[PDB]
Design an enzyme around this catalytic site. Structure first.
Site, mmCIF file in Angstrom:
data_model
loop_
_atom_site.group_PDB
_atom_site.id
_atom_site.type_symbol
_atom_site.label_atom_id
_atom_site.label_comp_id
_atom_site.label_asym_id
_atom_site.label_seq_id
_atom_site.Cartn_x
_atom_site.Cartn_y
_atom_site.Cartn_z
ATOM 1 N N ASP A 244 -63.640 16.660 -6.773
ATOM 2 C CA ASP A 244 -63.492 17.081 -8.161
ATOM 3 C C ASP A 244 -62.770 15.965 -8.900
ATOM 4 O O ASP A 244 -61.615 15.663 -8.602
ATOM 5 C CB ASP A 244 -62.675 18.375 -8.260
ATOM 6 C CG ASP A 244 -62.466 18.828 -9.700
ATOM 7 O OD1 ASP A 244 -63.159 18.306 -10.597
ATOM 8 O OD2 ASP A 244 -61.617 19.714 -9.937
ATOM 9 N N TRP B 240 -56.583 19.165 -0.873
ATOM 10 C CA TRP B 240 -57.435 20.284 -0.525
ATOM 11 C C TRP B 240 -58.436 19.636 0.430
ATOM 12 O O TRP B 240 -58.589 18.414 0.425
ATOM 13 C CB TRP B 240 -58.110 20.853 -1.787
ATOM 14 C CG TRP B 240 -59.069 19.924 -2.493
ATOM 15 C CD1 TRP B 240 -60.399 19.783 -2.206
ATOM 16 C CD2 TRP B 240 -58.784 19.017 -3.590
ATOM 17 N NE1 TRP B 240 -60.970 18.855 -3.029
ATOM 18 C CE2 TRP B 240 -60.014 18.367 -3.879
ATOM 19 C CE3 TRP B 240 -57.647 18.651 -4.362
ATOM 20 C CZ2 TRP B 240 -60.144 17.398 -4.881
ATOM 21 C CZ3 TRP B 240 -57.789 17.685 -5.355
ATOM 22 C CH2 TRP B 240 -59.028 17.072 -5.603
ATOM 23 N N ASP C 35 -55.488 12.605 -3.912
ATOM 24 C CA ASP C 35 -55.650 11.942 -5.202
ATOM 25 C C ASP C 35 -54.794 10.689 -5.334
ATOM 26 O O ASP C 35 -53.778 10.539 -4.652
ATOM 27 C CB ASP C 35 -55.285 12.886 -6.357
ATOM 28 C CG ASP C 35 -56.201 14.087 -6.450
ATOM 29 O OD1 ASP C 35 -57.343 14.009 -5.956
ATOM 30 O OD2 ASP C 35 -55.776 15.110 -7.031
ATOM 31 N N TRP D 289 -54.209 17.529 -6.743
ATOM 32 C CA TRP D 289 -53.591 17.254 -5.451
ATOM 33 C C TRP D 289 -52.841 15.919 -5.426
ATOM 34 O O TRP D 289 -53.237 14.979 -4.737
ATOM 35 C CB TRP D 289 -54.665 17.326 -4.348
ATOM 36 C CG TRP D 289 -55.120 18.763 -4.061
ATOM 37 C CD1 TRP D 289 -56.399 19.297 -4.178
ATOM 38 C CD2 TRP D 289 -54.272 19.850 -3.665
ATOM 39 N NE1 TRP D 289 -56.367 20.639 -3.890
ATOM 40 C CE2 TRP D 289 -55.084 21.004 -3.569
ATOM 41 C CE3 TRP D 289 -52.902 19.959 -3.381
ATOM 42 C CZ2 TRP D 289 -54.570 22.254 -3.199
ATOM 43 C CZ3 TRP D 289 -52.391 21.201 -3.012
ATOM 44 C CH2 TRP D 289 -53.227 22.332 -2.926
ATOM 45 N N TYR E 178 -53.610 12.630 -12.847
ATOM 46 C CA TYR E 178 -54.822 12.359 -12.083
ATOM 47 C C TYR E 178 -55.599 11.102 -12.480
ATOM 48 O O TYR E 178 -55.954 10.927 -13.647
ATOM 49 C CB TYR E 178 -55.764 13.562 -12.185
ATOM 50 C CG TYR E 178 -57.043 13.368 -11.421
ATOM 51 C CD1 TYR E 178 -57.092 13.586 -10.043
ATOM 52 C CD2 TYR E 178 -58.182 12.866 -12.053
ATOM 53 C CE1 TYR E 178 -58.239 13.302 -9.311
ATOM 54 C CE2 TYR E 178 -59.336 12.576 -11.332
ATOM 55 C CZ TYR E 178 -59.354 12.790 -9.962
ATOM 56 O OH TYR E 178 -60.469 12.459 -9.239
ATOM 57 N N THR F 278 -60.107 10.346 -6.933
ATOM 58 C CA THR F 278 -60.003 10.985 -5.621
ATOM 59 C C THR F 278 -60.656 10.137 -4.521
ATOM 60 O O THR F 278 -61.709 9.545 -4.735
ATOM 61 C CB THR F 278 -60.700 12.375 -5.638
ATOM 62 O OG1 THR F 278 -60.161 13.177 -6.704
ATOM 63 C CG2 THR F 278 -60.492 13.101 -4.302
#
Ligand code: HEC
Ligand SMILES: [Cu+2]
Ligand code: NA
Lengths: 125, 147, 105, 382
Positions: A26, A51, A70, A102, A113, A116
């Site tokens: 994500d 996750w 992340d 995360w 963020y 990822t």
């Protein structure tokens, strides 16, 4: 391509949203902003928590557990955005939830963020 | 016939130390011959099996074997892999493990050990399909434990 | 202050001393929820599953600052030597529902 | 850049007036406008902007399909709107150097007409839960005097902000539960990992009273992150991944579980239909109707846009209608007035489509709504 159709993984281009390791990613693919498939771009902070998801590898027919950690402390990269949810569960099952940022564990308490990464942490089911 | 070894040093278990009482039951004989514990999910002995566990094991492993000052015994993980089988579980109780988890032959008869084992299996919280110590019929009527 | 860190980074479980105080992590839980040890003892956590886990003590438990242990992959360990008597609660960073306790006496 | 028919009419009306005013000898005297008074047709659209460090909220007149104002926010803010239209606010996060440096979590309250902030309340120790925007992770008590927000780490907790006294009060420790549904000035419910609901009764001091309801759903039935909650009706509408709908009646002060109903017909479920999107469900209090975003999709594509909306009677579960939206829709909501408007937001088109909630007909649209608009909020002024 129909976004609602069953997701079909490939193992030949990590910058595409259908790359097998991104089955529950994500956000944005770090490789598109100076990082790599499993490393963070320069200047960002690597989170330790994340996750996870069991992603099927079409090359060897095995399923691996991917830890979506992340890279934080930077504004969102804006490059190679992707959103997949294979096996993704609601927020009350956080271990498999991907709307959560995360970034926990990142140096300097970085919580913004950027992108990822998709590292393998072990074999799954 | 099953091989009964000490789960720590691999030496053969010595049944000569077992109490003379409770070594004759059909359950014990069947077990020593096949490695199968007929008391598993047996409605008739479960009530007593629970009491045995409560008095001898709950203090360390928890009321429902969820773990306390000792490790849990209600899921698919076992420090000693062989404990996923009744031959292994029996071996652990008879010959002992490490620390305060010592041999039980001085306090439990062979039959009582099997009954205690049956209660531990009944406390399993995992998936029935993963209970390899159960027969097909037993799996059909098994439901993961819940307080 | 109330505990020291033998190793900053997780190590192979094979390196874990034999007969050492160990708390296994499997099936989303610390298998021994209420471990009792004596002052000076070194406790070792070992992750037994693919799902990564760690130990996390909030600020004011082992010191003035919280202790966010490193994430352990399958078959990796992490240790903590408690030097002060008391009860120490902890949890898993990404999995707040995972809780454990170490009672030092 | 590209004008919708609605803004095209507005642009023309404004040109006509400016030209006529000039011809009549009127002079231009610039000033700062006030937004029209809050009404049932005002709708708010939040743009999380794909996790950008800064975000925006658009204030829209749903009747005219016109942007009447905007509000700037930080990183992943949580918006709330008072049902009586007296104010709007959000829990937000900023950093000293854009996306790094010192972090400040705060609550900002705004005048609904002038849009000026009337309160800025700092939240100690950056307690906000940073996650994709879920409306019910930050909520207002029915009296509008208290704001509650969720903290995930280090441990589950609910922060209490006194909007009246403009101050942070305290953090409330709660079990492993999520979301916040206030039912009174001192009570709220949460949904727990074990499948039960938790009732939390708190005060100005002391540990809170926490009681659990029965478990209402199994481990393999997944409740979405965006349930619909009508505080005035005390109705919680919670869809599962398959479209099964759990309704909880909290109007008595205690949870009463209503019979679950299938939102999709037997034939649709057989043909692969499943709900999907962000804000997938909406509830109209006066008509007691449920609206759900659905389409044909694989079981693990639950966050993709949907092109249909099904409407059902919340009391009986009777299928009332199925609309073909004509666009890729991510989120929906409805005005709470007599003849409701159905709001359909497309994250990909960055456009808000406005439909008649009864016929499903598209009335107008508002485009250029940020970078990745996802949340629609309306007030129940009735
Ligand atoms: C505290 C004094 C205990 C009592 C009473 C009982 N057990 Fe125990 N058990 C204890 C410890 C500290 C340990 C770990 C030992 C080690 O070497 O690691 C154990 C372990 C077991 C096991 C093995 C579990 C595994 O993961 O393989 C089993 C099957 C077991 N214990 C069973 C058991 C039963 C049935 C008991 C009542 C008769 C019982 N234990 C009592 C500590 C203590
Ligand atoms: Cu964990
Ligand atoms: Na176990």
């Amino acid at each position: 391509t129909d976004p609602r159709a069953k997701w079909v993984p490939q193992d030949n281009d990590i910058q595409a949203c259908d790359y097998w390791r991104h089955c529950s990613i994500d956000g944005n693919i770090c490789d598109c902003s100076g990082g790599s498939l499993t490393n963070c771009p320069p200047g960002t902070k690597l989170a330790t928590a994340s996750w996870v998801a069991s992603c099927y590898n079409p090359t060897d027919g095995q399923s691996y557990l991917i830890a979506y950690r992340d890279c934080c402390g930077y504004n969102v990269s804006g490059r190679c955005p992707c959103l997949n949810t294979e096996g993704e569960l609601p927020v009350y099952r956080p271990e498999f939830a991907n709307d959560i940022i995360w970034c926990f564990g990142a140096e300097d308490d970085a919580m913004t963020y950027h992108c990822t990464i998709s590292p393998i942490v072990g074999k799954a089911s | 016939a099953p091989q009964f070894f000490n789960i720590i040093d691999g030496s053969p278990l010595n049944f000569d130390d077992a109490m003379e009482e409770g070594r004759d039951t059909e359950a014990v004989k069947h077990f020593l011959e096949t490695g199968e514990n007929v008391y598993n999910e047996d409605p008739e002995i479960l009530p007593e099996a629970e009491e045995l566990y409560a008095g001898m094991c709950s203090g360390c492993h928890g009321h429902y074997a969820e773990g306390k000052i000792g490790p849990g015994l209600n899921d698919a993980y076992w420090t000693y892999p062989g404990n996923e089988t009744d031959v292994g579980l029996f071996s652990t109780l008879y010959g002992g493990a490490t620390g305060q988890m010592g041999p039980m032959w001085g306090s439990l008869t062979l039959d009582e050990m099997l009954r205690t084992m049956a209660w531990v299996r009944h406390l399993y919280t995992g998936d029935p399909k993963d209970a390899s110590w159960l027969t097909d019929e037993q799996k059909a009527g098994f439901t993961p434990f819940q307080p | 202050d109330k505990a020291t860190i033998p190793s900053e980074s997780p190590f192979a479980a094979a390196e874990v001393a034999d007969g050492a105080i160990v708390v296994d992590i499997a099936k989303m839980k610390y298998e021994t929820p209420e471990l009792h040890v004596k002052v000076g003892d070194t406790v070792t956590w070992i992750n037994r599953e693919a799902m990564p886990h760690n130990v996390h003590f909030v600020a004011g438990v082992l010191g003035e600052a919280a202790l966010k242990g490193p994430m352990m992959k399958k078959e990796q360990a992490y240790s903590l030597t408690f030097t002060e008597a008391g009860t120490y609660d902890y949890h898993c960073t990404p999995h707040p529902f995972m809780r454990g306790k170490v009672v030092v006496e | 850049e590209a004008e919708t028919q609605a803004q095209e009419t507005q642009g023309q009306a404004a040109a006509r007036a400016a030209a006529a005013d000039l011809a009549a000898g009127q002079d231009d005297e610039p000033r700062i406008l006030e937004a029209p008074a809050p009404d049932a047709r005002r709708v708010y659209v939040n743009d999380p902007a794909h996790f950008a460090a800064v975000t925006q909220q658009f204030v829209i007149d749903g009747e005219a399909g016109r942007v009447i104002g905007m509000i700037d926010g930080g990183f992943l803010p949580n918006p709330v709107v008072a049902d009586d239209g007296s104010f709007i606010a959000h829990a937000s996060t900023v950093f000293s150097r854009i996306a790094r440096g010192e972090r400040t979590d705060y609550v900002e309250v705004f005048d609904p007409v002038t849009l000026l902030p009337t309160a800025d309340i700092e939240l100690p120790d950056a307690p906000r839960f940073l996650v994709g925007t879920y409306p019910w992770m930050t909520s207002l008590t029915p009296d509008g005097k208290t704001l509650l927000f969720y903290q995930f780490s280090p441990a589950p907790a609910v922060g209490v902000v006194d909007l009246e006294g403009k101050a942070f009060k305290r953090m409330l420790d709660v079990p492993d539960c999520y979301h916040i549904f206030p039912t009174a000035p001192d009570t709220f419910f949460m949904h727990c990992r074990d499948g039960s609901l938790a009732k939390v009764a708190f005060g100005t001091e002391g540990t809170p009273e926490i009681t659990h309801t029965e478990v209402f759903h199994p481990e393999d039935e997944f409740l979405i992150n965006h349930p619909a909650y009508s505080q005035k009706a005390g109705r919680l509408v919670w869809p599962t991944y398959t479209g099964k709908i759990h309704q909880i009646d909290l109007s008595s002060g205690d949870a009463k579980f209503l019979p679950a109903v299938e939102a999709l017909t037997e034939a649709e479920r057989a043909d692969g239909w499943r709900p999907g999107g962000w804000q997938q469900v909406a509830y109209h209090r006066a008509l007691d109707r449920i609206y759900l975003l659905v389409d044909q999709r694989d079981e693990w594509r639950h966050k993709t846009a949907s092109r249909f909306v099904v409407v059902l009677d919340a009391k009986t579960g009777e299928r009332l209608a199925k609309f073909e939206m004509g666009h890729e829709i991510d989120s929906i909501n409805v005005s709470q007035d007599e003849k409701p408007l159905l709001y359909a937001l497309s994250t990909g088109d960055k456009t808000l489509y406005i439909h008649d909630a009864e016929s499903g007909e598209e009335l107008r649209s508002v485009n250029q709504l940020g970078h990745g608009p996802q949340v629609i909020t309306t007030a129940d002024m009735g």
